[PDB]
Amino acid sequence: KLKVVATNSIIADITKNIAGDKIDLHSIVPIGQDPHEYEPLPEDVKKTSEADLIFYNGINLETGGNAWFTKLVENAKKTENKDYFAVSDGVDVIYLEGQNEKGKEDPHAWLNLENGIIFAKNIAKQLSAKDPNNKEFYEKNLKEYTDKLDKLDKESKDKFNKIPAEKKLIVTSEGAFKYFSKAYGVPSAYIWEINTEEEGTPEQIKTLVEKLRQTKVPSLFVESSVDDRPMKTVSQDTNIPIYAQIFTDSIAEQGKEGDSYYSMMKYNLDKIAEGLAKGNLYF
């Protein structure tokens, strides 16, 4: 079997849907954990060295202090675009908004299903190149998976139209919803823009608190892969409840709701619409 390493559970799940049992797949970043800053275990180091194919996010996910993925593949002596591939190649990138983050990409492409499709295309392409005997199989799985993703994408374009302007704002800890906001027509706000920066300072919380206390936003959200303390402080200081845990940088654990890329997205879309519609009744 082809030996394949994926950096996080989101890329791993998409690869599973394309490759099934035809490969030997390993995922580095454990479920629920931050993929921005991770220190690979010796078993991850060993799997990476022996891999014929490595998939990572690219666009500024696994690169920061101090570029853990770069260190891993360099030490394992793997070549970019021969041994390891960014699944984000081709995505319409959104950049970070911060004053000093000039030219720096926002990595969270997958929260737009259109990019999920691109991820899958990239994976299928690379698997096929390395494992021609299974090309037809990979391509068929790609066709089915992308149609499933596409139909959910097309259905969800108007999912937030019903939310009045005053209530219409996604609030999470990390500013991980830029692509989601653009794909499904709903603004987002945050405590900190990206995980590599300081995560939940008094000043950040205060900044978001004063923004919120002059909105009618009915619900806050927290991500499965961050410490919830900052958002809980935001909750107390604004009197806006946290409605639900949502998924950004990881899928859910097996057996939980959202334990794949597709159900993660379905769940996010569902739960976010619920929280912003909170209080709505027929009679």
Author numbering: 32 to 314
From the study:
The pneumococcus acquires Mn2+ via the PsaBCA permease, which comprises the ATP-binding cassette (ABC) transporter, PsaBC, and a cell-surface solute-binding protein (SBP), PsaA. Similar to other ABC permeases, the SBP PsaA defines the specificity of the uptake pathway. PsaA uses a ‘spring-hammer’-like mechanism for metal ion binding, in which the dynamics of the metal ion-loaded protein are dictated by a combination of metal ion geometry and the distortion of a helix linking the N- and C-terminal lobes of the protein.
Here the interaction of Cd2+ with PsaA was analysed by determining the structure of wild-type PsaA with Cd2+ at 2.0 Å resolution. The PsaA–Cd2+ complex revealed that Cd2+ was coordinated by the metal-binding site residues His67, His139, Glu205 and Asp280 in a structure that was highly similar (root-mean-square deviation (RMSD)<0.3 Å over 242 Cα atoms) to our previously reported Mn2+- and Zn2+-bound structures. Nevertheless, small re-orientations of the side chains of the metal-coordinating residues allowed the bulkier Cd2+ ion (ionic radius of 95 pm for Cd2+ versus 84 pm for Mn2+) to be accommodated into the protein–metal-binding site. In the PsaA–Cd2+ structure, the distances between metal-coordinating atoms and the metal ion were increased by ~0.2 Å compared with those for PsaA-Zn2+. Accordingly, the coordination geometry in the PsaA–Cd2+ structure is an intermediate between a square-pyramid and trigonal-bipyramid (n=5), in contrast to the 4- and 6-coordinate sites observed for the Zn2+- and Mn2+-bound PsaA structures, respectively. We then assessed the distortion of the linking helix by monitoring the number of disrupted backbone hydrogen bonds in its flexible region (residues 184–194) in wild-type PsaA–Cd2+.
